[PDB]
């Protein structure tokens, strides 16, 4: 087409969503560059699966999905196919045949408050593991014992979501990290997001 793909409206999001309620953006009908992503040095993590970043500028796709959220440092490893942990199982799971790229950078200067930034949450309890690209935002009281929680928190009755600490003095493994997961699909339809 002619219009450029609004990657500025997903990477530079003043506010990102919590990982349990990860935001998904649909990219379609635009020329997607790919030079400045792999050329920008702001990113701490840049790993691509199923395709190469150099061979990405000259390749067509029907749709491109930009999923963005916030986790902590030692949980960045889990944003990859075939990983396990609280984030991979209960918050954001990538399929074993994932074809895309994962991009993350430290946002401690933005997502930390000196009293502790308690706005970013993650799902701590769930009866079953999330299956790929599933989003669970329910806040149902987790009944961990026999006793039916009548919607009231207490003993063996949790709130399923836990809050990140996120204080600027935190260690690197506990500082906030903003993540962008670009997934490329090639459905049986003319393509809309190619590039260069």
């Amino acid at each position, epitope marked *: 087409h002619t219009n450029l793909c609004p*990657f500025g409206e997903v990477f530079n999001a003043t506010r990102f969503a919590s990982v349990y309620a990860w935001n998904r953006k649909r990219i379609s009908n635009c020329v997607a560059d790919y030079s400045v992503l792999y050329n920008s040095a702001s990113f701490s993590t840049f790993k691509c699966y199923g395709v190469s970043p150099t061979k990405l500028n000259d390749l067509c796709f029907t749709n491109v999905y930009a999923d963005s959220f916030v986790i902590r440092g030692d949980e960045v490893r889990q944003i990859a196919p075939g990983q396990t942990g609280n984030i991979a199982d209960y918050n954001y799971k990538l399929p074993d045949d994932f074809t895309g790229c994962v991009i993350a950078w430290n946002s401690n200067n933005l997502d930390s408050k000196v009293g502790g930034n308690y706005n970013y949450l993650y799902r701590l309890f769930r009866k079953s593991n999330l299956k790929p690209f599933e989003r669970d935002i329910s806040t149902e009281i987790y009944q961990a014992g026999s006793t039916p929680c009548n919607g009231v928190k207490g003993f063996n009755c949790y709130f399923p979501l836990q809050s990140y600490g996120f204080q600027p003095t935190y260690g690197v493994g506990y500082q906030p990290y903003r993540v962008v997961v670009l997934s490329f699909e090639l459905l049986h339809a003319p393509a809309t997001v190619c590039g260069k």
Partner: antibody
Amino acid sequence: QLVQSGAEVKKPGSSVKVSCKASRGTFNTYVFTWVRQAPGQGLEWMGGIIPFFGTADYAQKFQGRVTITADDSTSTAYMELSSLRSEDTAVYYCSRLSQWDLLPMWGQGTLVTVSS
Amino acid sequence: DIVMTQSPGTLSLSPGERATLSCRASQSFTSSYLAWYQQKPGQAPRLLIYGASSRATGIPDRFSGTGSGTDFTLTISRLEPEDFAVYYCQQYGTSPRMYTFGQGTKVDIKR
């Protein structure tokens, strides 16, 4: 961190062409627009161009009088304003966007004086 | 086009108070953004807030920004003497056609 050409002095009815050199080859991912500001007045958008496609759009108040071009090889955008009048005396700015961030880069501005 | 209207025309405030500036759009920001600029006499515009709620580099933390859709706000928690100038809001977009400015708001030392 755009760099514009020097100040200009023109007679009424003449034309002026202001350049805007992009820092290295950042060109194609960008949209470059031209905004002017008369002395002591507000900001007025004149037009824009998408370098990688050469597609340019303009404000109807200026349609015809302004032509915005671009050269990808030199990382430079251009704004030509013809049939100049005294009311065209202003500081002219070039500004841009980015494909992968939302941030407005601005040039230093070019003073164009249209009078005898 | 998208018409950007600012208010008030002149904001007469004492140094040390909290300033509040409004920026209205003719249509909801479907695929558009918003920045705030500050201009002092004889100077170029200076970017303060972008993306409605993103502080630019070097801008003091007393400058804040809020809003969504058609109504937006530029909040200055404590007005400093170096903050008495004209403020503009401009909406931008991925494409070239979007860009439009507001008519500006003068923040003067009240008396």
